[PDB]
CSV table of C-alpha atoms and ligand atoms in Angstrom, one decimal:
chain,number,residue,atom,x,y,z
N,5,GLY,CA,105.0,-46.2,-1.6
N,6,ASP,CA,107.1,-49.3,-2.3
N,7,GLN,CA,105.5,-52.6,-1.3
N,8,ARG,CA,107.9,-55.5,-0.6
N,9,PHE,CA,106.3,-58.8,-1.6
N,10,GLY,CA,108.6,-61.7,-1.1
N,11,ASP,CA,111.8,-60.8,-3.0
N,12,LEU,CA,110.1,-58.3,-5.3
N,13,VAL,CA,109.0,-54.7,-5.0
N,14,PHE,CA,105.8,-53.1,-6.4
N,15,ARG,CA,105.1,-49.4,-6.7
N,16,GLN,CA,101.8,-47.8,-7.8
N,17,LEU,CA,102.5,-45.2,-10.5
N,18,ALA,CA,98.9,-44.2,-11.4
N,19,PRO,CA,95.4,-45.4,-10.5
N,20,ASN,CA,95.6,-48.4,-12.9
N,21,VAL,CA,99.4,-48.7,-13.2
N,22,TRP,CA,102.1,-50.4,-11.0
N,23,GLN,CA,105.8,-51.0,-11.5
N,24,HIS,CA,107.2,-54.4,-10.7
N,25,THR,CA,110.8,-54.8,-9.7
N,26,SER,CA,112.9,-58.0,-9.4
N,27,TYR,CA,116.6,-58.6,-8.6
N,28,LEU,CA,119.3,-60.9,-10.0
N,29,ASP,CA,122.8,-61.3,-8.7
N,30,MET,CA,125.0,-60.3,-11.6
N,31,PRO,CA,128.5,-61.7,-10.6
N,32,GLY,CA,130.5,-58.5,-11.1
N,33,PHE,CA,127.6,-56.1,-11.0
N,34,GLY,CA,125.8,-56.7,-7.7
N,35,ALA,CA,122.1,-57.5,-7.4
N,36,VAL,CA,120.6,-55.7,-10.4
N,37,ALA,CA,117.0,-54.4,-10.3
N,38,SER,CA,114.8,-54.7,-13.3
N,39,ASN,CA,111.4,-53.0,-13.7
N,40,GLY,CA,108.3,-53.7,-15.7
N,41,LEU,CA,104.7,-52.7,-15.6
N,42,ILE,CA,101.3,-54.0,-14.6
N,43,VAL,CA,98.2,-52.2,-16.0
N,44,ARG,CA,94.6,-52.7,-15.1
N,45,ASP,CA,92.3,-52.2,-18.1
N,46,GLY,CA,88.8,-52.5,-16.9
N,47,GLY,CA,88.2,-56.2,-15.9
N,48,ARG,CA,91.6,-57.5,-17.0
N,49,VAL,CA,95.3,-57.0,-16.3
N,50,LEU,CA,98.1,-56.4,-18.9
N,51,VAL,CA,101.8,-57.0,-18.1
N,52,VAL,CA,104.9,-55.4,-19.6
N,53,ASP,CA,108.1,-57.5,-19.2
N,54,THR,CA,108.7,-60.6,-17.1
N,55,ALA,CA,110.9,-60.7,-14.0
N,56,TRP,CA,114.4,-62.2,-14.3
N,57,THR,CA,113.2,-65.7,-13.5
N,58,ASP,CA,110.2,-68.0,-13.7
N,59,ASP,CA,109.8,-68.1,-10.0
N,60,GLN,CA,109.9,-64.3,-9.7
N,61,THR,CA,107.4,-64.0,-12.5
N,62,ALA,CA,105.0,-66.4,-10.8
N,63,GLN,CA,105.3,-64.1,-7.8
N,64,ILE,CA,104.2,-61.2,-9.9
N,65,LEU,CA,101.2,-63.2,-10.9
N,66,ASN,CA,100.6,-64.0,-7.2
N,67,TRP,CA,100.8,-60.3,-6.3
N,68,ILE,CA,98.3,-59.5,-9.1
N,69,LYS,CA,95.9,-62.2,-7.8
N,70,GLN,CA,96.1,-60.7,-4.2
N,71,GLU,CA,96.1,-57.0,-5.0
N,72,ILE,CA,93.9,-56.8,-8.2
N,73,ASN,CA,92.2,-60.2,-8.5
N,74,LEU,CA,91.4,-60.0,-12.2
N,75,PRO,CA,92.7,-62.2,-15.1
N,76,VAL,CA,96.0,-61.3,-16.8
N,77,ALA,CA,94.9,-61.1,-20.5
N,78,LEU,CA,98.3,-60.7,-22.0
N,79,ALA,CA,102.0,-59.8,-21.5
N,80,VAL,CA,104.3,-58.0,-23.9
N,81,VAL,CA,108.1,-58.3,-23.4
N,82,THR,CA,110.4,-55.6,-24.7
N,83,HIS,CA,113.6,-57.5,-25.8
N,84,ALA,CA,115.4,-60.8,-25.7
N,85,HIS,CA,117.4,-60.4,-22.5
N,86,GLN,CA,116.8,-62.3,-19.2
N,87,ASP,CA,115.6,-59.2,-17.3
N,88,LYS,CA,112.7,-58.8,-19.8
N,89,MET,CA,111.9,-62.4,-21.0
N,90,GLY,CA,113.5,-64.7,-18.4
N,91,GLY,CA,110.1,-65.6,-16.9
N,92,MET,CA,108.3,-66.5,-20.1
N,93,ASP,CA,107.6,-70.1,-19.0
N,94,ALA,CA,105.8,-68.9,-15.9
N,95,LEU,CA,103.4,-66.8,-18.1
N,96,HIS,CA,102.8,-69.8,-20.3
N,97,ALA,CA,102.2,-72.1,-17.3
N,98,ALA,CA,99.6,-69.6,-16.2
N,99,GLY,CA,97.8,-69.6,-19.5
N,100,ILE,CA,98.7,-66.0,-20.4
N,101,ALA,CA,99.0,-64.9,-24.1
N,102,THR,CA,102.4,-63.6,-24.7
N,103,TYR,CA,103.8,-61.1,-27.3
N,104,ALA,CA,107.2,-59.8,-28.4
N,105,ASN,CA,108.8,-58.2,-31.4
N,106,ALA,CA,109.2,-60.8,-34.1
N,107,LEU,CA,113.0,-60.2,-33.9
N,108,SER,CA,112.9,-60.9,-30.1
N,109,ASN,CA,111.2,-64.2,-30.7
N,110,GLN,CA,113.8,-65.1,-33.4
N,111,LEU,CA,116.6,-64.3,-31.1
N,112,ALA,CA,115.1,-65.9,-28.0
N,113,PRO,CA,116.6,-69.4,-28.3
N,114,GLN,CA,120.2,-68.2,-28.9
N,115,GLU,CA,119.8,-65.9,-25.9
N,116,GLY,CA,118.7,-68.7,-23.7
N,117,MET,CA,115.1,-67.3,-23.6
N,118,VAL,CA,111.8,-69.0,-24.4
N,119,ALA,CA,110.0,-67.2,-27.3
N,120,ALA,CA,106.7,-65.5,-26.8
N,121,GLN,CA,103.7,-67.1,-28.4
N,122,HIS,CA,102.9,-64.2,-30.7
N,123,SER,CA,105.1,-61.9,-32.8
N,124,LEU,CA,104.6,-58.2,-33.2
N,125,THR,CA,105.6,-56.5,-36.5
N,126,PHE,CA,106.2,-52.9,-37.1
N,127,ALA,CA,105.5,-50.3,-39.8
N,128,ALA,CA,108.4,-48.4,-41.3
N,129,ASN,CA,107.7,-45.5,-39.0
N,130,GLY,CA,108.0,-47.7,-35.9
N,131,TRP,CA,104.4,-48.1,-34.8
N,132,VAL,CA,103.2,-51.7,-34.2
N,133,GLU,CA,101.0,-53.1,-36.9
N,134,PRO,CA,97.7,-53.2,-35.0
N,135,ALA,CA,96.6,-56.6,-36.3
N,136,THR,CA,99.7,-58.1,-34.5
N,137,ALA,CA,98.8,-56.5,-31.1
N,138,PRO,CA,95.1,-57.4,-30.7
N,139,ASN,CA,93.3,-56.4,-27.5
N,140,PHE,CA,96.2,-54.3,-26.2
N,141,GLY,CA,93.8,-51.8,-24.7
N,142,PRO,CA,95.7,-48.7,-23.7
N,143,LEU,CA,99.2,-50.1,-24.5
N,144,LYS,CA,100.7,-48.3,-27.5
N,145,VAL,CA,103.8,-50.2,-28.7
N,146,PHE,CA,106.5,-48.5,-30.6
N,147,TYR,CA,109.8,-49.7,-32.1
N,148,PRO,CA,112.1,-46.7,-31.9
N,149,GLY,CA,115.0,-48.1,-33.8
N,150,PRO,CA,118.1,-50.1,-32.6
N,151,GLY,CA,119.6,-48.9,-29.4
N,152,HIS,CA,120.2,-51.0,-26.3
N,153,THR,CA,119.5,-53.9,-28.6
N,154,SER,CA,118.4,-54.2,-32.2
N,155,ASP,CA,115.0,-55.6,-31.1
N,156,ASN,CA,114.2,-53.2,-28.2
N,157,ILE,CA,110.6,-51.9,-28.1
N,158,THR,CA,108.8,-49.4,-26.0
N,159,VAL,CA,105.3,-48.9,-24.6
N,160,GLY,CA,103.1,-45.9,-23.9
N,161,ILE,CA,100.0,-46.2,-21.7
N,162,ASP,CA,97.1,-44.2,-23.2
N,163,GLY,CA,95.1,-42.3,-20.7
N,164,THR,CA,98.1,-41.7,-18.4
N,165,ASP,CA,101.3,-39.6,-18.5
N,166,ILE,CA,103.5,-42.8,-18.6
N,167,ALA,CA,105.7,-44.2,-21.2
N,168,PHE,CA,108.1,-47.2,-20.7
N,169,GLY,CA,111.5,-47.1,-22.4
N,170,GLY,CA,112.8,-50.5,-21.0
N,171,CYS,CA,116.5,-50.8,-21.3
N,172,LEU,CA,116.8,-48.1,-24.0
N,173,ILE,CA,116.4,-45.2,-21.5
N,174,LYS,CA,118.5,-44.4,-18.5
N,175,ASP,CA,117.7,-41.9,-15.8
N,176,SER,CA,118.6,-38.2,-16.0
N,177,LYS,CA,121.6,-38.7,-13.6
N,178,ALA,CA,122.9,-41.9,-15.1
N,179,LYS,CA,126.6,-42.1,-15.6
N,180,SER,CA,126.6,-44.7,-18.4
N,181,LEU,CA,124.4,-46.5,-20.9
N,182,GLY,CA,124.8,-49.8,-19.0
N,183,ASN,CA,125.2,-53.1,-20.9
N,184,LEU,CA,126.1,-52.3,-24.5
N,185,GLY,CA,127.0,-55.9,-25.4
N,186,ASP,CA,124.2,-56.2,-27.9
N,187,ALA,CA,123.8,-52.5,-28.6
N,188,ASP,CA,123.7,-50.5,-31.9
N,189,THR,CA,126.0,-47.6,-30.8
N,190,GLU,CA,125.6,-45.7,-34.1
N,191,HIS,CA,121.8,-45.5,-33.9
N,192,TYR,CA,121.2,-45.3,-30.2
N,193,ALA,CA,120.9,-41.6,-29.9
N,194,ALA,CA,118.3,-41.3,-32.7
N,195,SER,CA,116.4,-44.2,-31.3
N,196,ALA,CA,116.2,-42.6,-27.8
N,197,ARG,CA,114.9,-39.4,-29.4
N,198,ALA,CA,112.4,-41.3,-31.5
N,199,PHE,CA,111.0,-42.8,-28.3
N,200,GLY,CA,110.5,-39.3,-26.9
N,201,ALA,CA,108.8,-38.1,-30.1
N,202,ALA,CA,106.5,-41.1,-30.2
N,203,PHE,CA,105.1,-40.3,-26.7
N,204,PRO,CA,105.3,-36.5,-26.5
N,205,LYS,CA,102.7,-36.2,-23.7
N,206,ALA,CA,104.5,-38.7,-21.4
N,207,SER,CA,105.8,-36.8,-18.4
N,208,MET,CA,106.7,-39.9,-16.4
N,209,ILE,CA,109.3,-42.1,-18.0
N,210,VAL,CA,109.6,-45.6,-16.7
N,211,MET,CA,112.7,-47.6,-17.4
N,212,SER,CA,114.4,-51.0,-16.6
N,213,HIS,CA,117.0,-50.1,-14.1
N,214,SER,CA,116.1,-46.8,-12.4
N,215,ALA,CA,113.1,-45.3,-10.7
N,216,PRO,CA,110.6,-43.4,-12.9
N,217,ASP,CA,112.0,-40.0,-14.0
N,218,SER,CA,111.0,-36.9,-16.0
N,219,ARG,CA,111.6,-36.5,-19.7
N,220,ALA,CA,115.1,-35.4,-18.8
N,221,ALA,CA,115.8,-39.1,-18.8
N,222,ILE,CA,115.2,-39.1,-22.5
N,223,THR,CA,117.3,-36.0,-23.3
N,224,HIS,CA,120.1,-37.1,-21.0
N,225,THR,CA,120.2,-40.7,-22.5
N,226,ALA,CA,120.2,-39.3,-26.0
N,227,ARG,CA,123.0,-36.8,-25.2
N,228,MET,CA,125.1,-39.6,-23.7
N,229,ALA,CA,124.5,-41.8,-26.8
N,230,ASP,CA,125.7,-38.9,-28.9
N,231,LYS,CA,129.2,-39.7,-27.5
N,232,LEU,CA,129.0,-43.2,-28.8
N,233,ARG,CA,129.2,-42.0,-32.4
Y,1,LIG,C1,126.4,-58.1,-18.1
Y,1,LIG,N1,125.0,-58.0,-18.4
Y,1,LIG,C2,124.4,-58.7,-19.3
Y,1,LIG,O1,125.1,-59.4,-20.0
Y,1,LIG,C3,123.0,-58.5,-19.5
Y,1,LIG,C4,122.2,-57.7,-18.7
Y,1,LIG,C5,120.7,-57.5,-18.9
Y,1,LIG,P1,120.3,-56.0,-19.8
Y,1,LIG,O2,120.1,-54.9,-18.8
Y,1,LIG,O3,118.9,-56.3,-20.5
Y,1,LIG,O4,121.3,-55.7,-20.8
Y,1,LIG,C6,122.9,-57.0,-17.7
Y,1,LIG,C7,122.2,-56.2,-16.9
Y,1,LIG,C8,122.8,-55.5,-15.9
Y,1,LIG,C9,124.2,-55.7,-15.7
Y,1,LIG,C10,124.9,-56.5,-16.5
Y,1,LIG,C11,124.3,-57.2,-17.5
Y,2,LIG,ZN1,118.9,-55.9,-22.4
Y,3,LIG,ZN1,118.7,-53.7,-18.8
């Protein structure tokens, strides 16, 4: 199932959906995997999250060229940390339109990230304002509230059973909530539950640092975040 392609790993999740995985040595944490998504929508490809680095992100584009061979119409990145935005320059060098939460773009320079070209804004209930996410096809973008970071966003794939929680959601056996350095600990639990309520039909939950899991990832993450209060 897993396909090793250079230093990256790709896994098909559905007929039109693949997970990309890249690794970065975290001095003190080992070589940390980070996952994003690749979605074919008709004659074009949509990407969720970069890899950790520009070189790795260029390799994602190389894999897309070889395995799908359709243009990448856009990428959306899910918060202003390196695992999700570290490869922005590679997307720009490739001519790909890029999108992030307005707050992620505001934070990008101080986080050492390059901002996306376009800013998403969100209604009070968390759903993306559609005018800011043109041509997103099956991607349904939802801001669940502050959690792993204040800017974290999530993405459902219409027509599939898949929703992507990024670094907000941990797997059903996870022992911790990971890096809380930029987290909102008071609101995390509610934000995790809001993600679940936004995508009630998603039976496959994809996340940044674990293999895809059932919805028990959501309940378990929320129950763990209850202890942060
Ligand atoms: C220590 N530290 C960080 O400062 C930031 C990240 C990326 P993120 O997962 O988006 O928070 C991180 C990831 C895994 C392990 C340690 C880490
Ligand atoms: Zn993060
Ligand atoms: Zn993470």
